[PDB]
C-alpha cells in the first residue's frame, strides 16, 4: 500500500485523544464540584486534580510522539 503512513499517523494522533479528553473533562468537573462543596479544601484538591490530568494527558501525549514518530 502507498500512503499508509499518513493514515497511520492521523489514526494514532486522533485515537489517542478521544479518551484522555473525556478523562480531563471528568477530572476538572469533579474537582470543581468538590471545591464547590467545600471551598477550604481546594488546596488539597487542586494538587490532586492536576496530577490527575497529567496522568491522563500523558496517555494522549503517547499518541502525539508516536504520530511524530510515524509522520516524521
Amino acid at each position: 500500500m502507498e500512503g499508509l503512513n499518513l493514515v497511520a499517523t492521523a489514526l494514532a494522533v486522533g485515537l489517542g485523544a478521544i479518551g484522555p479528553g473525556v478523562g480531563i473533562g471528568i477530572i476538572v468537573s469533579g474537582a470543581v464540584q468538590a471545591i464547590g462543596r467545600n471551598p477550604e479544601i481546594e488546596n488539597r484538591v487542586v494538587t490532586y486534580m492536576f496530577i490527575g490530568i497529567a496522568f491522563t494527558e500523558a496517555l494522549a501525549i503517547f499518541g502525539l510522539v508516536i504520530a511524530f514518530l510515524i509522520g516524521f
Binding site: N43, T47, A58, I61, F62, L64, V65, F68
Partner: protein
Amino acid sequence: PITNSFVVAIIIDIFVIALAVAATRNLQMVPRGLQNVMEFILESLYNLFRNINAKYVATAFPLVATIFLFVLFGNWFGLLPGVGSIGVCHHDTCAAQGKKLVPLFRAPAADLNFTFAIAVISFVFIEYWGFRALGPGYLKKFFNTNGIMSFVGIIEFISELVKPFALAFRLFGNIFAGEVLLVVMAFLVPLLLPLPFYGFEVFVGFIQALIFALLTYAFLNIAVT
C-alpha cells in the same frame, strides 16, 4: 556541535541570571518592582509546594524553581516575533542558495535533547531521595505481600520508569504543537486569525511549565511516602 535550541536556552539562561541579579542587587523589606514580582512568585510556589508536602518543601525548592523559570521562559520565547523567521541558512526567504531557512530562535523545549535532561534528572532525584529515607522498601515490589502483591508491585515499577518519559514527551509535544499551530495559522491568514491561538500558546506554555514542577514534586511526595 550545537543546535539552534541551545542558543535560545543560553539566552534564557542570560535572562534568568539578569533577573535574579537585579532582584538580589537591592534586598530590603517592602519590595516594589521586579524584586516584588520575583518574591511573590517564589512565595506562591513555596505555598503551592507546601500544600503537597511541607517536609521537603524547603529542600527541593531551588530545583523546581529553576525548572519552572527555565521552561516558562523557553516556552514564551517561541511566541516572540522573529522566532521561526530568522534564518541562519548554514518559499524560504533564503531561496537563493537554499538551506531550508533554519530558524535561529528555536524554543528550548521544542527538542528531544534538552527536555530529556530534566526528565532524567527528576528520575535520579526520585530514585536518590526515595532511597534516602526508605532503604529497600522504597522500590519494594511486595512479592505476594497481600496475596501476590508482587503483580501490582511490578506493573507500578514500569509506570515509574515511564513517568520521566511521559513528562519529557508531554513538554516537547505541547511546545512543538504550539509552534506548528502558530506557523500553520500564520500561513493560513497572515493577520488577525491566530489571535485566539497566540494567547492560547503562551497560556499553555506557562501551564505546562508550572505542571512540570508540580508533577515532579508530586512524584517525590508519593515516592518518599
